[PDB]
Amino acid sequence: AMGSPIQVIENDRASRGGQVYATNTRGQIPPLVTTDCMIQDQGNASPRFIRCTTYCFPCTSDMAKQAQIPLAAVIKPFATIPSNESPLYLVNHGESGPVRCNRCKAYMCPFMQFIEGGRRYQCGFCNCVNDVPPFYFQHLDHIGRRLDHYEKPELSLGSYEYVATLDYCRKSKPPNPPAFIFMIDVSYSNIKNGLVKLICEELKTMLEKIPKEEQEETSAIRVGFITYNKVLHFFNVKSNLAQPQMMVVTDVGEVFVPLLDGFLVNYQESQSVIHNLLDQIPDMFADSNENETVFAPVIQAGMEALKAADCPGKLFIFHSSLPTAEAPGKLKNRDDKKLVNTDKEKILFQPQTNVYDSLAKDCVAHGCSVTLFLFPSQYVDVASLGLVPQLTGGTLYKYNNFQMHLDRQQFLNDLRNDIEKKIGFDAIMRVRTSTGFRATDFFGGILMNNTTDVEMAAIDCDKAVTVEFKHDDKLSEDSGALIQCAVLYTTISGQRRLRIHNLGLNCSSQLADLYKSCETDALINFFAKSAFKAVLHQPLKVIREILVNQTAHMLACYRKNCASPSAASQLILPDSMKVLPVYMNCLLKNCVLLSRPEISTDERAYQRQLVMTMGVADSQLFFYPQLLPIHTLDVKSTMLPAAVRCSESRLSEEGIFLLANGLHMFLWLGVSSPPELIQGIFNVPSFAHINTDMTLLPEVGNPYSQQLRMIMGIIQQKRPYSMKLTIVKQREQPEMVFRQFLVEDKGGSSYVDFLCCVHKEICQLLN
């Protein structure tokens, strides 16, 4: 009998929900992601920005090697700070630039000790003494509080931004503002399903909403347009034309951009032109009988254009089918049965060609970020198509078997949402640490060419990066462990800025303290990514083995070291890790580490990619889906129906449920469902009547439906990806797929089969 995930979620919800958590204490253990509390800074960066797998590190390499807890930090730097919480301050140290430790080069933060009357300070990270520069000098007070320590946000806060001076800029000239390039696949596929005109029509609408800082009057971001079908059509949209000009480039193989000026333009100046263009593109290609297309030469071009304007930018590519047309970048239609113990299964998660990896390199090199809206209808080799956006720090939206009368809304939101996203460009992040350890590994929508500087062509409030630490030397139980996460980037107003997150953690030589300070959600997040990146180098049986052997080894160490003497028939878990065997099982149960029958490679590669980026908020939900009961729903006044475990063993034939994992949202109806509900909710009298196929939100009724809609609304609200709704008839219908999201069930092995499997290897090791 184990503490269920939901018991644990709700417990901590009770204990800490709707209470202010203020980060003023080193090594504090923030609430779980599944708790909506209020956060106040006061010292250590908000857990909305950063969470760790332990908030108390081990102090010796051996001790860590003993417990086999991974030390790691999930970082989501540009996370959306909620309305009722404090915004980041923008600190500005003048011409000199932000103050820094001379040796580690750490930025002025609260972990900087002032000594000798305020003349000098000693870095917390490296224990080196720096001279306080004249302009920045101030008087220590009673204890060196350095009067002003509550006034200046670089001295008292965990998170703030620095204003970046010119030596932080490419070529030491102030960076230009970015630009969005909009790129449409106008082949036959996409003229038929009605997609192209959707994209052109809505956009007319959308462009308006491009973001602009509050200090400026119009967005400084320029906009350009290209449409391709195995040949690339560029459009001129300069301010002075009543008609837009088209210039086709047919020499793919050595692509180039046919113009300078007229390609990227202020939307407002060139408004009328652009509408006239966007009016015409759909018609323009109406009798296109073309079938094959080209992909890489499109990114290639977009990148070359942002190179030529000398600015960072974001590519908005809308594409349909496997690019088969002969150009560099061709992808053959090959999928193979090399995937159980093959040891070559890794070839399936890699791109086909060596051009995608380099191209990704070219983009990051020039601050170009590509985003891909993909509308498959057959194998598309997402392993290759989605490689560039992932390394380039963009997104992959994939809409299988898209149909205009269903997923039109899914698509339109994601485009709306991706445009208006707060964004940063041409960023490089690096995570500094106190004496005694260093970041040795990274996992994200990222690209690294040395071992220190995480390069991210673009970054949004949604993308997160997990950072794995190992041990250099030794950590003191006096100092604790420090992290300073610092991100160089370029704003949409063309300013170089420096976001800085500082965290302070405790350290300890007592193995007890290690396990007391763990976070499951974060540990899962590290494991997941660590595993998923391994997919590209090792066999999936070797991967899973490493995962189980390190799960047991964790509990086995806590058994034989901090476990009060209890019988050998028991499995003793600490409190931070009640639910870790459960979650760990679900990770291994997920198709990315599992087998072919009934899943495409595409669905596997898509999943493999999405996760890497994920925050801790998102990686929680994706592996342990939310299952809401709706038949028992209260009529009014309550935020949501409490959650229920993810097993078929909580389903009622008289019932109506809602399951979401962050990408799919299922609405499920028992054969015996109460037709009263079936009429308010769907407006049809009989379970018999309703159609799985007509998955379009339902218009009418006010008693329920509305209650249902809102909660689904409550459900969507913080997720980046609007979720495809999938109605499910209870028996003898598709539910076969829905079943797969019932994660505590068997389907590999169930929760009570892995909890059994780990206790075998736990006892394999004894004493």
Partner 1 sequence: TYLEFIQQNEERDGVRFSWNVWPSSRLEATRMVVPVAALFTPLKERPDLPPIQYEPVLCSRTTCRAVLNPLCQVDYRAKLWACNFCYQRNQFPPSYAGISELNQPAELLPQFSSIEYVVLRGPQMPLIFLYVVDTCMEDEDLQALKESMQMSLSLLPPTALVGLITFGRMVQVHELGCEGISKSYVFRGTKDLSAKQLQEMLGLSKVSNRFLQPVQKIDMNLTDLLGELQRDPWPVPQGKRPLRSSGVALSIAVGLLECTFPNTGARIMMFIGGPATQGPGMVVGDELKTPIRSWHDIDKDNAKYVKKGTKHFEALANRAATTGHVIDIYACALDQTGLLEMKCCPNLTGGYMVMGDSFNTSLFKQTFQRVFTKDMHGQFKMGFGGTLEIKTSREIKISGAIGPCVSLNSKGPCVSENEIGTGGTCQWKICGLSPTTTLAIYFEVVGRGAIQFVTQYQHSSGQRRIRVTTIARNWADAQTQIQNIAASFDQEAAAILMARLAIYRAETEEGPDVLRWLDRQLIRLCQKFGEYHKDDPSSFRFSETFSLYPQFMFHLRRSSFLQVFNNSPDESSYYRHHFMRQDLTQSLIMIQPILYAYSFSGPPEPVLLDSSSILADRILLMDTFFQILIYHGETIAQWRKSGYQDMPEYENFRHLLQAPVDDAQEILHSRFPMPRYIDTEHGGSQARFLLSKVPILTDDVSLQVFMDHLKKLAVS
Identity at 606, one-letter amino acid code: Y
Tell me how far, at minimum, the Cβ of 746 lies from partner 1, in Å. Answer: 57
User: Using CB under 8 A, which of 215, 240, 250, 449 touches partner 1?
Assistant: 250
Q: Which does 123 bind (CB under 5 to 8 A by kind): partner 1, Zn ion, none?
A: Zn ion
Q: Is 254 in the site for partner 1 (CB under 8 A)?
A: yes
Phi-psi category of residue 57: left, alpha or beta, with phi > 0 → left and psi -120 to 50 → alpha: beta
Q: Is 244 in the site for partner 1 (CB under 8 A)?
A: yes
∠ at Cα 552 (548, 557), nearest 5°?
150
Integer CA distances (angstroms), 590 to 264, 623, 689, in order: 43, 8, 34
Q: Which does 106 bind (CB under 5 to 8 A by kind): Zn ion, partner 1, none?
A: Zn ion
User: Using CB under 8 A, which of 56, 67, 106, 249 touches partner 1?
Assistant: 249
User: Using CB under 5 A, which of 39, 101, 372, 579 touches Zn ion?
Assistant: 101
Q: Is 245 in the site for partner 1 (CB under 8 A)?
A: yes
Q: Which does 261 bind (CB under 5 to 8 A by kind): partner 1, Zn ion, none?
A: partner 1
Nearer to Zn ion, 68 or 122 (CB): 122
Does 101 show up as a binding residue in the annotation?
yes
Does 37 show up as a binding residue in the annotation?
no
For 370, phi and psi rounded to 5 degrees?
Answer: -110, 140
Tell me how far, at minimum, the Cβ of 328 lies from partner 1, in Å. Answer: 15
Interface with Zn ion in residues 182-211 (CB under 5 A): none
Does 123 show up as a binding residue in the annotation?
yes
Tell me how far, at minimum, the Cβ of 254 lies from partner 1, in Å. Answer: 7
Q: Is 239 in the site for partner 1 (CB under 8 A)?
A: no
Q: Which of 462, 505, 515, 466 is nearest to 721 (CA)?
A: 462
Q: Single out the segment in contact with partner 1 by CB under 8 A; choices: 69-77, 122-130, 246-254, 409-417.
A: 246-254
**And the tokens for 324?**
């088969």
Contact 276, 244 (CB under 8 A): yes
Residues 6+ apart with CB under 8 A from 354: none
Q: Is 2 in the site for Zn ion (CB under 5 A)?
A: no
Tell me how far, at minimum, the Cβ of 264 lies from partner 1, in Å. Answer: 14
Nearer to partner 1, 304 or 745 (CB): 304
Alpha-carbon distance 705 to 113, whole Å? 59
Q: Which of 507, 533, 505, 711 is nearest to 626 (CA)?
A: 711
**And the tokens for 128?**
């080196």
Task: Give me the residue whose beta carbon is nearest to Zn ion.
Answer: 101
Nearer to partner 1, 97 or 258 (CB): 258
**And the tokens for 148?**
């002003």
- Say how many residues make up the chain: 767
Residues 6+ apart with CB under 8 A from 153: 89, 91, 160
Alpha-carbon distance 448 to 456, whole Å? 9
Q: Is 291 in the site for partner 1 (CB under 8 A)?
A: no
Nearer to partner 1, 258 or 629 (CB): 258
User: Using CB under 8 A, which of 102, 243, 595, 652 touches partner 1?
Assistant: 243
Tell me how far, at minimum, the Cβ of 280 lies from partner 1, in Å. Answer: 6
For the chain, the straight-line distance linking the first and the last C-alpha, in angstroms and rounded, comes to 24
User: Using CB under 8 A, which of 60, 66, 127, 280 touches partner 1?
Assistant: 280
Q: Is 251 in the site for partner 1 (CB under 8 A)?
A: yes
Q: Single out the segment in contact with partner 1 by CB under 8 A; choices: 1-9, 63-71, 250-258, 488-496.
A: 250-258
Tell me how far, at minimum, the Cβ of 170 lies from partner 1, in Å. Answer: 22
Tell me how far, at minimum, the Cβ of 292 lies from partner 1, in Å. Answer: 14
Q: Which does 125 bind (CB under 5 to 8 A by kind): Zn ion, partner 1, none?
A: Zn ion
Alpha-carbon distance 58 to 153, whole Å? 30
Nearer to partner 1, 260 or 512 (CB): 260
Q: Which does 101 bind (CB under 5 to 8 A by kind): Zn ion, partner 1, none?
A: Zn ion
Q: Which of 78, 21, 13 is nearest to 55 (CA)?
A: 21
The CB density around residue 354, as the number of other CB atoms within 10 Å, is: 8
Give me the residues paired with residue 115 across strands.
120
Tell me how far, at minimum, the Cβ of 180 lies from partner 1, in Å. Answer: 22
Write b or e for each residue in 682-715: b if 16 or more Cβ atoms lie within 10 A of its Cβ, otherwise e.
beeeebeebeeeebeebeebeebbebbeebbeeb
Does 763 show up as a binding residue in the annotation?
no
Q: Which of 299, 164, 274, 282 is nearest to 210 (CA)?
A: 274
Integer CA distances (angstroms), 346 to 349, 532, 613, in order: 6, 11, 20
Q: Which does 126 bind (CB under 5 to 8 A by kind): partner 1, Zn ion, none?
A: Zn ion
User: Using CB under 8 A, which of 256, 578, 674, 761 touches partner 1?
Assistant: 256
Nearer to partner 1, 236 or 730 (CB): 236
Alpha-helix residue ranges (DSSP H) falling in 17-127: 61-67
Q: Which does 258 bind (CB under 5 to 8 A by kind): partner 1, Zn ion, none?
A: partner 1
**And the tokens for 699?**
């218009």
Q: Single out the segment in contact with partner 1 by CB under 8 A; choices: 259-267, 437-445, 448-456, 633-641.
A: 259-267
Q: Which does 259 bind (CB under 5 to 8 A by kind): Zn ion, partner 1, none?
A: partner 1
Q: In what helix (H) or strand (E) does residue 433 lie, and over which residues does it extend? A: strand 423-433
Binding mask 121-150 for Zn ion (x = CB under 5 A): --x-xx------------------------
Q: Is 736 in the site for partner 1 (CB under 8 A)?
A: no
Q: Is 247 in the site for partner 1 (CB under 8 A)?
A: yes
Residues 6+ apart with CB under 8 A from 37: 16, 17, 18, 19, 20, 21, 31
Nearer to partner 1, 259 or 651 (CB): 259
The CB density around residue 259, as the number of other CB atoms within 10 Å, is: 16
Rg of the Cα atoms in the chain: 27
Residues 6+ apart with CB under 8 A from 633: 641, 704, 707, 708, 711
Alpha-carbon distance 463 to 488, whole Å? 16
**And the tokens for 537?**
């180098």
Tell me how far, at minimum, the Cβ of 294 lies from partner 1, in Å. Answer: 13
Contact 367, 374 (CB under 8 A): no
The CB density around residue 174, as the number of other CB atoms within 10 Å, is: 13
3-state secondary structure of 476: coil
Q: Single out the segment in contact with Zn ion by CB under 5 A; choices: 94-102, 266-274, 395-403, 594-602.
A: 94-102
> CA neighbours within 13 Å on the CB side: how many for 661?
19
Binding mask 321-360 for Zn ion (x = CB under 5 A): ----------------------------------------
Contact 280, 184 (CB under 8 A): no
Q: Single out the segment in contact with partner 1 by CB under 8 A; choices: 19-27, 56-64, 258-266, 715-723.
A: 258-266
**Residue carrying structure tokens 């379009």:** 696
Q: Which does 260 bind (CB under 5 to 8 A by kind): Zn ion, partner 1, none?
A: partner 1
Q: Which does 136 bind (CB under 5 to 8 A by kind): Zn ion, partner 1, none?
A: none
Integer CA distances (angstroms), 306 to 193, 207, 302, 361, 639, in order: 31, 19, 6, 15, 46
Q: Is 365 in the site for partner 1 (CB under 8 A)?
A: no
User: Using CB under 8 A, which of 17, 258, 328, 748 touches partner 1?
Assistant: 258
Tell me how far, at minimum, the Cβ of 26 lies from Zn ion, in Å. Answer: 18
Write b or e for each residue in 546-579: b if 16 or more Cβ atoms lie within 10 A of its Cβ, otherwise e.
ebbeebbbbbbbbbeebeeeeeeeeeebbebbbb
Nearer to partner 1, 250 or 564 (CB): 250
Q: Is 542 in the site for partner 1 (CB under 8 A)?
A: no
Residues at the interface with partner 1 (CB under 8 A): 233, 243-251, 254, 256, 258-261, 280, 284
Question: Which stretches of the chain bind Zn ion, using CB under 5 A?
Answer: 101, 104, 106, 123, 125-126
Which residue ranges make up the annotated binding site for Zn(2+)? 101, 104, 123, 126
Please give the annotated binding residues, written as ranges. Answer: 101, 104, 123, 126
